[PDB]
Amino acid sequence: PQETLNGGITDMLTELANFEKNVSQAIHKYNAYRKAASVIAKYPHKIKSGAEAKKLPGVGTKIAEKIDEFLATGKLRKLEKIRQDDTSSSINFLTRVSGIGPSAARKFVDEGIKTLEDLRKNEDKLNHHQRIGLKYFGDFEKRIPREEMLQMQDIVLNEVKKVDSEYIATVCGSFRRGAESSGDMDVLLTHPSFTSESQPKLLHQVVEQLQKVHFITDTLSKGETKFMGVCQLPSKNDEKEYPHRRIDIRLIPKDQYYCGVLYFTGSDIFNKNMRAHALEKGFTINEYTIRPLGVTGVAGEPLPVDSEKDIFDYIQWKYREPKDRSE
DNA sequence: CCGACGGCGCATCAGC
DNA sequence: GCTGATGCGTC
DNA sequence: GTCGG
Ligand code: NA
Ligand code: NA
The missing domain is CATH 3.30.210.10 (DNA polymerase, thumb domain)
Structure with missing residues (x-):
């Protein structure tokens, strides 16, 4: 469906979803709003009333009423009010910093830290993840053209096979589904020497090599089976730098690999x-x-x-x- | 009326 | 020192 | 917030 159908409603529900998650800390209400926003976004008719929407699975009484208010007024009183609210809007915003969830954002705003500038002023209150998140705030919300993804795949598959030609690597996510752009890179990794019933450095060697050729720039978290970090394509000639990208690398046992790939x-x-x-x-x-x-x-x-x-x-x-x- | 609503790796906090 | 809880980002 | 035992 075209966005112009019920986009005002879906934006409404999505915005409500975020405040539930980030401010109210009600994760199930957050998913409830998103689910209702999903079934409406795929609804092939312009909604005339909340009663019409309530026929859809995931749309109950309360959302039917909000839709009626939106249709008749073009807005929501509660959403309008929470938008102006200094505390609530600051809390909601800070959660866009990777590493800062509802709990961290709440603490920051409680002590007067509301903006990226305040965050930049108080670096010693941020943990390692949050500093990286703050450092690449802009970059992390940018999307990745498939063209850049394919170039990122070139580097990954090459360095991985370079470390050990027996590795099996698969770039998944929406990219594998052939999407025109992606939000991040998800790499799934296995090795013949790694099964359910069985060395604790297989992931380290891959990360280290990707670090050696300056593909991986930062580390959010790293263990023996999972890596979460940052990466950057090399710049050519005299051209402008590429954005820094989120990249995950998982080491999966051989017998659990293809369930992982599908998943x-x-x-x-x-x-x-x-x-x-x-x-x-x-x-x-x-x-x-x-x-x-x-x-x-x-x-x-x-x-x-x-x-x-x-x-x-x-x-x-x-x-x-x-x-x-x-x- | 009331519980489910995804389960888990990793970093870090709460506490012994 | 350690174990467990919590937070966080996620299919 | 919505669904369903
Ligand atoms: Na319904
Ligand atoms: Na965040």
Whole structure:
């Protein structure tokens, strides 16, 4: 649907979602607003009344009333008021800094820290993640053209194979689904020497090499199975610098790899559909495994998986290439 | 009326 | 020192 | 906030 259909309503619900998460710290209300915003955004008609919207799953009484108020007034009293509120708007804004959640933002604003400038003034109150988040505030909210993603993939796959040619690396996310742009880079990593029933430096070596060639610039978090950090494409000739990008690298066991690849390829909506249909045919699919729901409903042992298709096979659904996985 | 609503790696806090 | 809780970013 | 036991 075109945005002009019910965009005013969806923007309304999304804004309400953020204040619930960031200010009220009610994560389930946040998701409730987003869900209602999702089903409305995919609704192929211009909504005439809240009663019309209430027919949709995820839209209840309270949102039906807010829609009626929005249709009749072009705005929401509560949303208008919370927008002016100095404390609430400052708290909501600070959570756009990676590393600052609702709890940290609350603390900062409690002691008078409301803006990026105040944050910059009080560096010694920020942790390592929050400093990196503050440093790349602008960059992190920029999106990544597929062209740059493909260049980022070139570097990753090359350095990874350079460290050990036996690595298997797969760039997932919306990129793998063929999206024209992405929000970050998600790299999934496995090795023949790493299984469920089994060296604690496999991830380190990959990160280190990507650091050595100055692709990875900063570290948000790093352990033995997961890396979260920053990366930057090299600049050419005399041209302007590229933005710094968010990049995640996960080390997954070989027997859990393709469940991981499918899972982190997404999308959200596709994965639920696939999960929901997995349920109706007697299987359960998580990030790690596919498991057969038993007589009583007790998941037996994880089944052998050699590819994404192996999983599709089990649940009797026909394989679908990543470009057709938005739902 | 009332509970579910995603579960987890990592960094860091609360506390022994 | 340590264990556990909490916060954070996430399919 | 919405859904459903
Ligand atoms: Na409904
Ligand atoms: Na944040």
